Design a protein around this ligand. Structure first.
Ligand SMILES: CCCn1c(NC(=O)CC)nc2ccccc21
Length: 185
């Protein structure tokens, strides 16, 4: 792809994080701790899942960033509306304000409703995410496989400001402790 010149510097918003997440000093990495991280509760925190938002809000333009997913077994990545539900159970879908892909149980899927099987020959270690606000597009790229396309959401109805979205996944297996990391420009 040729989206690299739209690169934006994303940082994580501590205030939105589930209470078990640990965000690095530079706000560029996040991992799920094995206990509550001793923060107060607030209406912004995702309560039921190990999720966090980027601090940046996008309402126009073209934006690109990259995320390192090395040695993880489960994660979700993409964008979401600023006003998505934080508390209780919900599905990741465009109806609920999410444009995401995931890894789960050795398969990759897009967060449509119902979910869509992805076709990935080279398991990615870094994911590129491109948003074209005006066009209504969210695309995902396999940086490990020379930038090959993973998935495009088109005809998106964002209906609000967008925020970068992350889920580090649970670590029931003991094989999913590694962080998500925002890769340097
Ligand atoms: C993994 C054990 C701790 N735990 C549970 N346990 C439950 O399943 C209670 C409904 N939910 C969490 C949601 C976010 C972070 C930690 C959570």
């Amino acid at each position: 792809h040729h989206h690299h010149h739209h690169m934006v510097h994303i940082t994580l918003d501590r205030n939105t994080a589930n209470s078990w997440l640990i965000i690095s000093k530079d706000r560029r990495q996040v991992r799920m701790g094995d206990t509550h991280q001793n923060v107060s509760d607030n209406k912004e925190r995702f309560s039921n899942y190990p999720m966090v938002l980027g601090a940046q809000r996008f309402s126009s333009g073209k934006m690109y960033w990259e995320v390192d997913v090395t040695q993880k077994e489960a994660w979700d990545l993409g964008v979401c509306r600023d006003s998505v539900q934080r508390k209780g159970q919900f599905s990741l879908s465009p109806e609920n304000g999410f444009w995401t892909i995931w890894l789960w149980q050795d398969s990759y899927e897009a967060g449509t409703s119902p979910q869509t099987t992805l076709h990935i020959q080279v398991p990615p270690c870094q994911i590129g995410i491109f948003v074209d606000y005006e066009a209504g597009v969210v695309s995902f790229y396999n940086i490990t496989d020379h930038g090959s396309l993973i998935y495009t959401f088109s005809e998106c109805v964002f209906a609000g400001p967008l925020r970068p979205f992350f889920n580090v996944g649970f670590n029931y297996s003991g094989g999913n402790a590694a962080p998500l990391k925002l890769c340097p420009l």
